[PDB]
From TrEMBL, chains A, D:
The lineage of its organism: Bacteria, Pseudomonadati, Pseudomonadota, Gammaproteobacteria, Lysobacterales. It comes from the Bacteria. This is AvrRxo1-ORF1.
TrEMBL record, chains B, C:
This is AvrRxo1-ORF2.
């Protein structure tokens, strides 16, 4: 569909859609009362989940920390958090994964609008979900636990660009939080098939091709800037970069831990700090039998191989761009 | 493979930064020659900012980072896009998603 | 695609030369860091020239081109080769064929 | 086998094998008389073929020219000469392809040694064949046709490096020949499968992996230096670069013709002027069903597809390095 929920549920003369439309809508009172109520309910839920996370982390001895999960769409971020950040894995278990700062966590609820079925598309609810995420993050800034300590929080966003990274470092510095950053990379094609595997009945986003490609370019091009921040300031926190081997498994590539910088996989480090651009397109590559076989050849896990296969076959004969476009349009 | 540590890790990082900086600049230089050759519309941030929002809701306020993000995207990532009006649709798509 | 002509062709060529020069230097710089890290034998043309012929039968007489050919090959093309004695076998293989 | 024919048929205290061993053997009288006779016979044949080529070219109005076919092993050089150099195609028809400066043209004869069967390997005869090629080229330098004009000649060698290119430019300048240079590129994998398709009963060389890979690196790394020579000096002659599209067909990529420099395919030009190296190997890639299917997916011609398939299947399960090594060892 077409009209955004910010336009449908906003009240009055809506400011032309660039910012100016944000402060207007950033004011929780330019919305219809029913929508205002939905916002309050969703923020209460998210805040409850975040506090559960924070109390779990503190009980497990974690100093106030901003856990940042950097990386492009469908690169395996969730599995890395689960396996490689044990204290956070323990916390997320208690909330079934809820409580992280991420606009996408509000999308399903906004899309269903308490009616029992999804009636708005992800794109239709995105601005509103972003507004809620910003209000959610704002309240978390100085949120305390029961011991009066600053609450640890989790930021689950692409975090590709310098300005975003700087902003979260500044937030951490101002609130006395360490930054624990895991940066997760996969080849662009892995993200594309990852998106096609996400089912609309799930809550993981299904963006169109340009989002995944531009995200890939941005995350790779700005990666070394992020690493430089940790190399320069040992007190900032810790950094780990995981990349994807040929067989699809994640491996440590570079790290800054306790101020010590190491490169665990120099070959991958050279590769995953560059977008592999040329003057003129993976977007036009057709999903054919060969491509599916080519991807299957490097997937050994039966369940993963079957799911990859099924997702691709649904779009057999279409270009990556056409495939992700069609997949994204599903409600 | 063998983990690079200490001075070797730092020197590898330094040299790799130089390599990627050269590649970064080169991608844009080559794209601009090709753009001139095919008659692609000259990048105009202000005209761009008329038809779409480049602000990321006021988070991106640095003029230097803002021009550099979109000019480079326009030329390097979307070489077959000929007009800023076309590119506008792309940018709008990008901010419709996380 | 559209053929680049005249000034555009020349500028593309110039910029591409710069790009490839940067890549050329970078490949060697990175290879040398990795070589130091793993303990690869330091490149020694004279010791090399004891165990094999680098002359291409006296066609290659420039000392600058000769060192630069084999040092770069040793470090960039055969990173897993640890010794000049090993590399010697490679070089001999190369001149056993056109 | 192991002992080279220069050692078997050379006379006396053979100089340690680097040059010094060349002038010794460059003297046609440090060989056994029978071998001396074979040399004379082969050079007479080659010279006859070269003169036929030269007289054909002159009759077709070609000024004295050095036709240089630059490019790595098994990149499609012969087909390009046949299709894209019509005057030379007409000449080569008259000699069934013989008469070009290339050590490989002597190898079959030296390997059979007039016995009726190949009893020496290509590697065993290479030094001797190179010696013959140099004597052949030396005599061609100032060779005249029946009109007293300098004979046009064809140099069919990799011609990768600056010193080689400089040497042939100097030869052309000193002898009043134009340089007509066609430079032919294919992806490294195309050269590898090209080599595996060459049958030992044929006369095309079957080198091991390092020859093809190092040749690829050299030809690409020094390509723009060659182009610069033609951009700088319009009087030198003409230059055309052909590269390989995804479907395997050759296309014009860049050219310097009548002093005019153009880039017919900028994407390919960016690609084929660089070796695509990383800090650490196609040599270890295993020829499996997927790889064969992957290569077959981009070959539409039935005969070519079948031959590619058959060559690869013979080495199924082996790495590219192991496959070319085994293939090279065949007599």
């Amino acid at each position: 569909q077409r009209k955004g929920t910010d336009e449908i549920y906003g009240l009055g003369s809506l400011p032309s859609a660039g910012p100016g439309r944000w402060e207007y809508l950033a004011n929780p009172g330019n919305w219809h009362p029913e929508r205002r109520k939905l916002h309050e309910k969703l923020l209460d839920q998210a805040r409850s989940s975040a506090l559960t996370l924070a109390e779990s982390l503190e009980s497990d001895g974690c100093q106030p920390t901003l856990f940042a999960l950097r990386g492009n769409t469908a690169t395996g971020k969730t599995r890395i958090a689960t396996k490689k950040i044990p204290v956070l894995a323990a916390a997320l278990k208690k909330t079934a994964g809820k409580g992280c700062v991420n606009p996408d966590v509000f999308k399903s609820s906004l899309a269903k609008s308490e009616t029992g079925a999804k009636i708005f598309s992800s794109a239709q609810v995105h601005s509103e979900s972003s507004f809620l995420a910003d209000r959610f993050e704002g309240g978390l800034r100085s949120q305390k636990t029961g011991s009066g300590a600053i609450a640890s929080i989790v930021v689950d966003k692409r975090l590709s660009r310098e300005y975003e990274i700087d902003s979260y470092i500044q937030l951490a510095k101002e609130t006395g939080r360490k930054v624990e950053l895991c940066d997760i990379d996969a080849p662009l094609e892995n993200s594309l098939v990852g998106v096609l595997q996400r089912k609309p009945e799930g809550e993981d986003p299904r963006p169109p091709y340009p989002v995944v490609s531009s995200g890939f370019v941005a995350v790779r091009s700005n990666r070394m800037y992020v690493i430089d921040r940790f190399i320069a300031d040992p007190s900032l926190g810790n950094y780990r970069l995981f990349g994807t081997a040929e067989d699809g498994e994640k491996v440590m590539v570079a790290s800054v831990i306790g101020g010590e910088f190491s490169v665990e996989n120099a070959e991958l480090y050279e590769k995953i700090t560059s977008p592999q651009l040329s003057v003129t397109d993976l977007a036009d590559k057709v999903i054919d039998k060969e491509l599916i076989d080519r991807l299957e050849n490097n997937i050994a896990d039966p369940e993963r191989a079957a799911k990859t296969r099924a997702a691709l076959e649904k779009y057999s004969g279409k270009s990556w761009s056409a495939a992700l476009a069609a997949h994204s349009e599903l409600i | 493979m063998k983990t690079l540590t200490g001075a070797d890790a730092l020197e590898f990082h330094k040299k790799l930064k130089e390599r990627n900086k050269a590649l970064h600049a080169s991608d844009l230089e080559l794209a601009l020659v090709h753009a001139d050759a095919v008659g692609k519309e000259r990048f105009d941030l202000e005209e761009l900012e008329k038809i779409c929002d480049t602000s990321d809701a006021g988070r991106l306020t640095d003029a230097k980072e803002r021009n550099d993000i979109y000019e480079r995207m326009y030329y390097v990532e979307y070489p077959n896009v000929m007009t800023l009006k076309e590119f506008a649709h792309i940018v709008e798509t990008l901010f419709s998603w996380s």
